[PDB]
Amino acid sequence: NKLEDVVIDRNLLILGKILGESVMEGNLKQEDGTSLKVAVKTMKLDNSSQREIEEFLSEAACMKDFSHPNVIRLLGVCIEPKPMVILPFMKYGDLHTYLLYSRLETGPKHIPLQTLLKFMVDIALGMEYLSNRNFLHRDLAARNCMLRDDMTVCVADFMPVKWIAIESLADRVYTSKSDVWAFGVTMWEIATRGMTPYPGVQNHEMYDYLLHGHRLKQPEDCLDELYEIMYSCWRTDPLDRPTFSVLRLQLEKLLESLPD
């Protein structure tokens, strides 16, 4: 079919050093003759059937067609029976490490409230886009949000139980509203500038902790208005959580009320 319209000739790609193990730096030769710096995620698939490859190549097909500043564009796929996902290389890396760096004197200056909110808005904008294409993220976390060269935030990858919604921990279900829950935790990650969610609480204790009605606490710096937006992402009934479309406007309106 046209699921070779996402496959790229292996010859056009050279792999460099491992960035995490695997993710590698790379050079892609583009249709216009120039060379682009790429990141290259390699996936070990269950090759006992075709199920994994079908799911992969399908999702990849429409991930490639995602055009939006706050969503990472998939450039294509290579097969060395070993598939490789080819994404733009982001010199500024993930948001989580950026926030940690900001708390060092040598790293980025003290990020003000305004900038933290814009990051949250950027991520809402990307998730609002993905919701419109009826496309589940399933791994929203600060570490999976990338910084474009203009310092705008795009979403990427589309037991991490501390980002998984109560209904998804128990029932084994995942909807747009679970992504909203994950966006809540991400917002908290940003306001705390990179704290692990739920200090005091071990991973295996998270279901009971949530079940007894407890949620992430308001960070020290955090505006009440911001914390009420964050909290709204963790309401027990998925149907009570706002849409990304609502969250994005609430955050834009908050950001616009703060001075320049």
CATH at residue 140: 1.10.510.10
Q: Is 178 annotated as belonging to a binding site?
A: no
Burial class (CB in 10 A: 0-12, 13-18, 19+), 221: exposed
Determined by which method? X-ray
Answer yes or no: do 219 and 187 share one domain: yes
Answer yes or no: do 71 and 177 share one domain: no
Q: Is 239 annotated as belonging to a binding site?
A: no
Write out the catalytic residue numbers. 139
Resolution (A): 2.7
Provide the residue count of the chain.
Answer: 260
Residue of 251, 164, 178, 250 whose CA lies nearest to 206:
164
Answer yes or no: do 134 and 36 share one domain: no
What are the residues facing 154 on neighbouring strands?
146
Residue 84, in any domain of the structure: yes
- Which phi and psi angles does 235 have, rounded to 5°? -65, 140
Q: Residue 88 is which amino acid? A: P
How many other CB atoms sit within 10 Å of the CB of residue 19? 15
Answer yes or no: do 83 and 113 share one domain: no
CA distances, 169 to each of 4, 6, 162, 165, 204 (Å): 36, 34, 10, 6, 11
Answer yes or no: do 63 and 121 share one domain: no
Residue 253: domain span: 93-257
Q: Is 23 annotated as belonging to a binding site?
A: yes
Answer yes or no: do 166 and 73 share one domain: no
Q: Is 21 annotated as belonging to a binding site?
A: yes
- Which phi and psi angles does 117 have, rounded to 5°? -65, -45
- Locate all alpha helices (DSSP H) within the chain, ordered by sequence: 51-63, 95-102, 113-132, 166-170, 176-191, 206-211, 224-231, 244-257
Answer yes or no: do 209 and 224 share one domain: yes
DSSP 3-state percent helix, strand, coil across the chain (nearest 5): 40, 15, 40
Residue 2, in any domain of the structure: no
Residue 72, in any domain of the structure: yes
